[PDB]
Amino acid sequence: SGEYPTVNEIPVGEVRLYQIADGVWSHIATQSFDGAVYPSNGLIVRDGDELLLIDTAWGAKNTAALLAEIEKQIGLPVTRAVSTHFHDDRVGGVDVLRAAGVATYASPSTRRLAEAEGNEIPTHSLEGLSSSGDAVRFGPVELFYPGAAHSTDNLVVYVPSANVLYGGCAVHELSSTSAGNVADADLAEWPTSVERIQKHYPEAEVVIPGHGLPGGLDLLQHTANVVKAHKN
């Protein structure tokens, strides 16, 4: 009823949207992984009379439910999607999107890693993002490669019209006590990558983590703090 939805409030298979700003929503879904249930976020950005989707809803059935929720709540077609790294919470559901007429995109690095991992593979490569600090425009957002953090390929997304910073899994929520799933992470480089985000987007008003509650710029420093403590 208006608060940001939490893991115990979303059954696996259902998707909720949350209005972040004019023409900006997050999407929240839940999924089981290795015997535990986790929430995950993505983003929806209005692109005229179309929508840009950032990240799947972590699975084929969740992503079908995401498209149905968008049709119910927004009623504009999703025409393009960007996956911000290669894990299943970002690309799982790309096949559903592709069969629904959505053009799917990711960096070449993400596409290679997804293919090697056995995950679904976005169709189109996003060039111009291979060096840390790189940025490119994509419809109503800017895509930014901060360097290795949660994964080597992780991208962040900025919505300039609303000063919304979607950090993806490179950014953790304020309640986080550990660096999450670090199997593919670079803990030594992650603080430097967060510092690049902080320097590039100093006017961000909302920061959305890959999992958990949005907040302000403090999520960036908190993330650096938890990652440094974990690495130790």
Ligand X SMILES: C[C@@H](c1cccc2c(-c3ccc(CS(C)(=O)=O)c(Cl)c3)c(C(=O)O)[nH]c12)n1cc(CCCN)nn1
Note whether 149 binds Zn ion by CB under 5 A: no
Q: Which of residues 42, 59, 147, 210 is near ligand X by CB under 6 A? A: 210
Element (H, E) at 114: helix 108-117
Q: Would you list which residues are annotated within the binding site?
A: 85, 87, 89, 125, 127, 150, 169, 211
Note whether 186 binds ligand X by CB under 6 A: no
Q: Give residues 105-164 in contact with ligand X (rule: CB under 6 A).
A: 150
Give the CA distances from residue 94 to residues 36, 82, 129, 161, 172, in Å, rounded to whole numbers and listed in that order. Answer: 23, 10, 21, 27, 24
61 vs 211 by CB, closer to Zn ion? 211
CA 152 from chain centre, in angstroms, equals 15
46 vs 150 by CB, closer to ligand X? 150
Closest CA to 25 of 208, 174, 212, 160: 208
Note whether 43 binds ligand X by CB under 6 A: no
Q: Which of residues 59, 146, 210, 215 is near Zn ion by CB under 5 A? A: 210
- In angstroms, the CA 185 to CA 31 distance is 21
- Residues present in the chain in total: 232
CB of 150 vs Zn ion, minimal distance in Å: 5
- In angstroms, the CA 30 to CA 25 distance is 17
Residue range at the interface with ligand X (CB under 6 A); choices 16-24, 82-90, 137-145, 191-199: 82-90
Note whether 225 binds ligand X by CB under 6 A: no
The SS3 assignment for 98 reads helix
Contacts to ligand X by CB under 6 A? 33, 38, 87-89, 150, 169, 172, 176-178, 180-181, 183-184, 210-211
